[PDB]
Design a protein around this ligand. Structure first.
Ligand SMILES: C[C@H](CCC(=O)NCCS(=O)(=O)O)[C@H]1CC[C@H]2[C@@H]3[C@H](O)C[C@@H]4C[C@H](O)CC[C@]4(C)[C@H]3C[C@H](O)[C@]12C
Ligand SMILES: [Ca+2]
Ligand SMILES: [Ca+2]
Ligand SMILES: [Ca+2]
Ligand SMILES: [Cl-]
Ligand SMILES: [Cl-]
Ligand SMILES: [Cl-]
Length: 124
């Protein structure tokens, strides 16, 4: 679920900015997206979006109001290391996996301030 994705990110990037949740980043970091990612970080988000899209296409899975972000799962954090619980059901494991990979991807990408709250309608 969305709130778990945020904690997962805190887990991988302890020095994250709490107020960052109020803003969007690049072309894909945020609800929806358009065009092509502007940088590595943005790519991580697009990929995560794509991962959720695949989640919505799983024949055996249908989420509340069709939003994968509502699906809560179980996971643990240890030394900035994320682990999805094997007890998660297939749908939850798929979502937990998308989040884990995205969080890891975020931790390795450069944060470019110029892309914060980008004028998407013009550069995306
Ligand atoms: C983890 C990312 C920032 C990394 C960073 O702050 N590096 C600097 C570290 S340091 O000071 O130099 O130590 C931030 C950039 C924009 C953020 C995204 C945007 O805020 C858009 C949404 C907001 C939602 O609440 C959570 C998912 C999300 C899709 C966020 C995931 C994550 O929190 C992102 C991808
Ligand atoms: Ca998005
Ligand atoms: Ca269902
Ligand atoms: Ca659940
Ligand atoms: Cl989002
Ligand atoms: Cl349902
Ligand atoms: Cl459900």
């Amino acid at each position: 679920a969305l709130w778990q994705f945020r904690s997962m990110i805190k887990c991988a990037i302890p020095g994250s900015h709490p107020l960052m949740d109020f803003n969007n980043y690049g072309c894909y970091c945020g609800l929806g997206g358009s065009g092509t990612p502007v940088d590595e970080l943005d790519r991580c988000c697009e990929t995560h979006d794509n991962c959720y899209r695949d989640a919505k296409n799983l024949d055996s899975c249908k989420f509340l109001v069709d939003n994968p972000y509502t699906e809560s799962y179980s996971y643990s954090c240890s030394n900035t290391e994320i682990t999805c619980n094997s007890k998660n059901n297939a749908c939850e494991a798929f979502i937990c996996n998308c989040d884990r990979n995205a969080a890891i991807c975020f931790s390795k990408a450069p944060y470019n301030k110029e892309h914060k709250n980008l004028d998407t309608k013009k550069y995306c």
